[PDB]
Design a protein around this ligand. Structure first.
Ligand SMILES: [Ca+2]
Length: 140
C-alpha cells in the first residue's frame, strides 16, 4: 500500500520569491509492516536553512494553509535537516530523511502532511504567521 503528499506553500511569504511552482517537497509513503508506514521525505527550494519538523494534521482542508487543517494528529520527533544549498542565486536549501510511524496507510489518507520551521524574521511577514510551512493532502 502506498500514498503520496505533494507539499506546497499556501501562504505568501516575503522570503519566498520562487514563482515557477509552489512545490517545496514530497512525501512518498509506503506501508512496510502490518501497522507501520515509511515516509520518504525530500525538501527543495526553501529560503531558510535549518531544522524543519513534520506532523500530520487532522483535516485535509488546506484552503487556508496550515490554519485550516485543525490540530496536530501525529507528530514526528526526528527533525528534517535542510542545510544543503541547492539554489545559489536565490540561496535556497534542500534536505531529506526517512521517517516512520506505527500507522497503516489507510488511516493516513485524506489528512494533511505538514512541514514547518519558525521564521528567522517574523516581523517582516507579521504577526500571526510565525512559521514557514508547506503542506499537502495525503492521497492514495
Ligand atoms: Ca535564503
Amino acid at each position: 500500500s502506498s500514498a503520496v503528499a505533494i507539499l506546497e506553500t499556501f501562504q505568501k511569504y516575503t522570503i519566498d520569491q520562487k514563482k515557477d511552482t509552489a512545490v517545496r517537497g514530497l512525501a512518498r509513503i509506503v506501508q512496510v509492516g502490518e501497522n507501520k508506514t515509511l515516509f520518504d521525505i525530500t525538501v527543495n527550494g526553501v529560503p531558510e536553512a535549518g531544522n524543519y519538523h513534520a506532523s500530520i494534521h487532522e483535516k485535509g482542508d488546506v484552503s487556508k494553509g496550515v490554519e485550516s487543517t485543525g490540530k496536530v494528529w501525529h507528530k514526528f520527533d526526528e527533525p528534517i535537516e535542510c542545510f544543503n544549498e541547492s539554489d545559489l542565486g536565490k540561496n535556497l536549501y534542500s534536505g531529506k530523511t526517512f521517517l516512520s510511524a506505527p500507522l497503516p496507510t489507510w488511516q493516513l489518507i485524506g489528512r494533511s502532511f505538514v512541514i514547518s520551521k519558525s521564521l528567522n524574521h517574523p516581523e517582516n511577514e507579521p504577526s500571526s504567521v510565525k512559521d514557514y510551512s508547506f503542506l499537502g493532502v495525503i492521497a492514495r
